[PDB]
Amino acid sequence: VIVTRSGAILPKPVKMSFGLLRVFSIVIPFLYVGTLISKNFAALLEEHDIFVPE
Amino acid sequence: VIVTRSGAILPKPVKMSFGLLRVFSIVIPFLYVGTLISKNFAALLEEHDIFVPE
Amino acid sequence: SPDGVRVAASTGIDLLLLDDFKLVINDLTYHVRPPKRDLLSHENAATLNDVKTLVQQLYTTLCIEQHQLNKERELIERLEDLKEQLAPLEKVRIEISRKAEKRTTLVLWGGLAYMATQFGILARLTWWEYSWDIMEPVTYFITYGSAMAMYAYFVMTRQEYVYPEARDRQYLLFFHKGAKKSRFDLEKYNQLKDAIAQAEMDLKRLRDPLQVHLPLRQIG
Amino acid sequence: QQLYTTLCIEQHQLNKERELIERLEDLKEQLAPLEKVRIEISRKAEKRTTLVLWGGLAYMATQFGILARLTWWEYSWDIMEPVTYFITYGSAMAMYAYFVMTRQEYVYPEARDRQYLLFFHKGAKKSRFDLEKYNQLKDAIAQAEMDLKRLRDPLQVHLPLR
Amino acid sequence: DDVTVVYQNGLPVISVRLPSRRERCQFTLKPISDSVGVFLRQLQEEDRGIDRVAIYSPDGVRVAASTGIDLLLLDDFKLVINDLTYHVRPPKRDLLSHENAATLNDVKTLVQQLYTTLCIEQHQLNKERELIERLEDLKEQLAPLEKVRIEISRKAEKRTTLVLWGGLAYMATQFGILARLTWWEYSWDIMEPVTYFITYGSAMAMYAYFVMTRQEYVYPEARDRQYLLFFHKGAKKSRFDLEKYNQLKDAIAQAEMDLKRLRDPLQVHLPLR
Amino acid sequence: ARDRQYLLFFHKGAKKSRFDLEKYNQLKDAIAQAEMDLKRLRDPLQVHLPLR
Ligand SMILES: CCCCCCCCCCCCCCCCCC(=O)OC[C@H](COP(=O)([O-])OCC(O)COP(=O)([O-])OC[C@@H](COC(=O)CCCCCCCCCCCCCCCCC)OC(=O)CCCCCCCCCCCCCCCCC)OC(=O)CCCCCCCCCCCCCCCCC
Ligand SMILES: CCCCCCCCCCCCCCCCCC(=O)OC[C@H](COP(=O)([O-])OCC(O)COP(=O)([O-])OC[C@@H](COC(=O)CCCCCCCCCCCCCCCCC)OC(=O)CCCCCCCCCCCCCCCCC)OC(=O)CCCCCCCCCCCCCCCCC
Ligand SMILES: CCCCCCCCCCCCCCCCC[C@@H](O)O[C@H](CO[C@H](O)CCCCCCCCCCCCCCC)COP(=O)(O)OCC[N+](C)(C)C
Ligand SMILES: CCCCCCCCCCCCCCCCC[C@@H](O)O[C@H](CO[C@H](O)CCCCCCCCCCCCCCC)COP(=O)(O)OCC[N+](C)(C)C
Ligand SMILES: CCCCCCCCCCCCCCCCC[C@@H](O)O[C@H](CO[C@H](O)CCCCCCCCCCCCCCC)COP(=O)(O)OCC[N+](C)(C)C
Ligand SMILES: [Ca+2]
Ligand SMILES: [Ca+2]
């Protein structure tokens, strides 16, 4: 809805200050540690001869 | 719902004029330029010896 | 005040006659002594309040139908003045809500154009150049990235990502910059739009005691 | 009309609205100590709700990183595809267990409000806040304002226009 | 010819063909805050090829230049421009202001309200005395029925609880079956189409639920629907009449609503609604 | 979507039969208004009718 019960226009939607930078500063350095965790876990499980595919 | 708080009938819902041809005249040529973008990008990536399917 | 200080202008009269005061006319100072109104009975005054509130209800019905005709014509005159004061601003308001709706249909058609070109990218690259076994995880992470962006929309806007609410939000964000670029005051238009609804809600609250002679309903 | 004058009814009506205005502005006198505590509690409850919102976003990014490393670097997609199906089905099980346990569906702007109310009602008991007196004052002010708005109704003749 | 005016959202406009310019000039008007002389003053501002302008009556007598246009636009009239007399017939309205002269019905409703406000307190107190007895009678008439309705609404709750946890146990056994098949016995190259067709069968069953029950399949509505089905099937095998219980509860609420609607006017001396 | 398809079927049938829908709608609102102000005249609290 874009109006009230009268014809008066609704107020401006409250944007968040630096919203896109606040999302991309919390996605990227957690995606990096999510890469590092899985890399170290795969290497630690491979080195002890438990799961090797090839 | 279909009726008001009394027994009256809600009015006819508005219809976009020639809706399916307006959707299909913007679905088809963007699909075609998507195939063109992907074909030229894969040809460029194969021609510079980066990712060649083998 | 009798110690020498001056009494201010908008001091109530009931506060004034508690103690003495001095009234100064051009050259003369009179020393007024107000009496003490010690007739405060607690008993035989909860029976004076009911008669005093019955006389008010008897006077009200004698003077209520000639009052709600003066108020009716004053409401009609204020309504037809507010409409002529609003009518220059209306043609300016419509031409801001026409650019703000064309910029919203460009977003609504470019979402469909983006989905159709992503379909054409994956359908070209799956059957022609690379196989489906190569191009399956790309589609899966496209799906998971969309399921992550739909949550980032909620984390940034405090509003769930559905289609018409996001369309209305984007429309209002377009309107509140179109109405800022073109030097348009939204506050006077909103107070000229709520005053009309307030003045014509009371006009239909007067339908009861003037058309069918029933007692009118309260505010709320 | 000769009883409306000798009983002094107009000053009685203005005395009545003066009593209503004084009761309204004395109900707002014992509220201003309480909102200084309530604003503090609501602020340090929203500051904890945004923590779990950003934590959920960081968790989804971490799961993206974990499932993106193995399908291309270490293993193949033929190993990690059933794992990433069963993660999806486990999420679909957890969103139903939320409904069985919480008696409401799992959507974002209602889970946020419920979590905010749980944080607020933990903090209001931790700070020994007197919530019931606050709710009684917030009801009584909203009733006294409605009574005052009905007393000075312009379509009635309850008070003289002077 | 200007045989008519045009109505635009409650305001009139006269399309008067001007004398010395061959055009149908529009003229919007405020009916309440304008007179005839204002309209003749601003009609001749347009061309000044006007040597005579006068608004007449249908009978032929002149209309004064101080009567308002709302009093003019009640009936039809004539507008005499300097050679031709345009008969104007505006569209008929119902009412704008409910104002006219005095009537015997007005004084007969005045003594009606003067009779009402002398006896409405001694009638409202005699009605509140009836209400405070009627409410306690209804609330003690209901005391055998609530003891039975609680025992029915506890059986229906303890059955829908088992339906909820049984659905959770089903979607947790399907996980175990599929996770046993894809890793121990068979492989994912066998069990991927069964996974897809189970997902599509669930998406088909959620639409068949909508076709049968005429409502969408969401969780807290599909819980309450099955709860009401358990309640109405359980209250029929216990000889419990809901048509008495429902009319007792709504009658209690109506008496309480009328009590709270009259008791506060006894406090603050305002009208009721 | 079911209710929108129902309204698009009903408003086509009402143009085929020439049903005069707006007289129906204004009568259906007018009898609700006449029952509302009749029910506010038979009030048990307001003494509007004698012998009661
Ligand atoms: C630097 C290092 C590396 C870089 C990494 C990535 C960088 C990418 C950059 C992306 C950023 C976008 C930039 C936009 C910023 C400015 C936006 C703006 O001003 O827009 C004005 C306009 C109105 O502005 P306004 O009135 O001021 O209002 C401001 C906001 O709208 C007010 O909004 P609000 O407050 O109401 O809330 C809305 C909010 C809602 O927030 C969101 O929705 C945020 C969503 C993102 C969250 C994070 C997603 C997680 C993704 C995971 C990443 C995985 C990485 C892969 C790695 C894996 C392996 C390890 O924010 C927005 O919607 C902002 C709009 C931007 C959309 C962002 C979408 C980009 C997604 C990209 C993700 C990553 C890409 C993967 C790359 C893959 C590589 C192969 O805003 C719009 O919404 C309009 C949309 C238009 C968008 C672009 C239009 C393009 C059109 C081109 C022309 C077409 C021509 C046709 C040709 C014809 C041929 C036939
Ligand atoms: C020549 C052709 C002709 C053929 C015709 C022959 C057809 C057979 C005729 C059968 C008719 C017999 C009537 C039976 C009466 C049953 C009444 C009853 O149970 O009393 C309950 C009674 C309550 O009675 P009531 O008061 O009348 O209320 C009942 C309703 O509320 C009623 O009102 P409502 O308004 O709530 O209505 C909602 C309604 C409607 O809502 C629905 O859910 C509709 C479902 C229909 C959708 C159909 C989906 C299509 C699937 C695709 C086909 C796959 C084929 C693949 C072939 C590929 C080859 C190329 O739900 C139900 O009533 C049904 C309950 C659950 C049914 C779920 C069954 C669907 C799955 C069947 C697929 C079979 C897969 C086999 C694969 C085998 C592989 C080796 O007490 C209860 O305990 C309450 C029920 C508790 C909740 C549900 C409990 C589930 C019970 C059995 C489930 C077993 C485990 C689940 C396994 C999942 C499958 C994977
Ligand atoms: C200056 C003026 C600019 C004009 C030109 C602008 C051109 C912009 C081009 C991009 C258009 C904006 C895209 C908006 C639509 C995206 C399409 C998206 O909605 O489709 C989804 C695909 O998702 C996308 O892949 C990810 C996009 C996530 C949206 C992030 C918000 C970005 C838009 C912010 C502006 C809001 C505009 C809203 C327009 C509808 C469907 O996936 P699905 O899962 O099946 O649907 C789930 C059902 N839900 C939505 C009810 C839950
Ligand atoms: C307190 C100190 C700070 C703690 C900081 C650490 C935070 C840890 C992270 C906790 C997570 C809580 C937030 C949950 C975010 C998960 C987002 C969820 O949507 O992801 C889904 C994946 O599911 C998740 O794995 C779990 C599902 C949720 C079940 C657990 C509920 C946890 C709620 C706990 C209360 C907290 C309030 C919730 C905040 C939003 C994938 O999305 P999708 O599949 O497309 O859902 C469809 C969209 N619907 C729901 C609107 C229809
Ligand atoms: C005598 C006492 C009686 C005892 C009877 C015991 C019976 C035990 C078994 C009962 C089975 C009930 C099943 C409950 C539903 C299972 C959970 C369901 O949600 O799984 C879905 C898959 O299941 C299928 O959809 C089947 C459901 C179709 C309807 C089945 C019949 C329901 C009749 C009973 C209704 C009351 C159920 C209680 C609420 C769940 C997953 O869908 P998903 O994609 O992941 O998320 C979609 C989210 N939506 C729904 C909001 C959009
Ligand atoms: Ca898949
Ligand atoms: Ca394969």
Residue numbers in the entry:
A (entry chain E), B (entry chain F): 48 to 101
C (entry chain C): 129 to 348
D (entry chain D): 184 to 345
E (entry chain B): 73 to 345
F (entry chain A): 294 to 345
Paper lines:
The Ca2+ influx is mediated by MCU, driven by membrane potential and using a uniporter mechanism. Patch-clamp analysis of MCU currents demonstrated that MCU is a channel with exceptionally high Ca2+ selectivity. The MCU subunit comprises three structural domains: the transmembrane domain (TMD), the coiled-coil domain (CCD), and the N-terminal domain (NTD). The TMD of MCU is known to be responsible for Ca2+ selectivity and conduction, and each MCU subunit contributes two transmembrane helices to the TMD: TM1 and TM2.
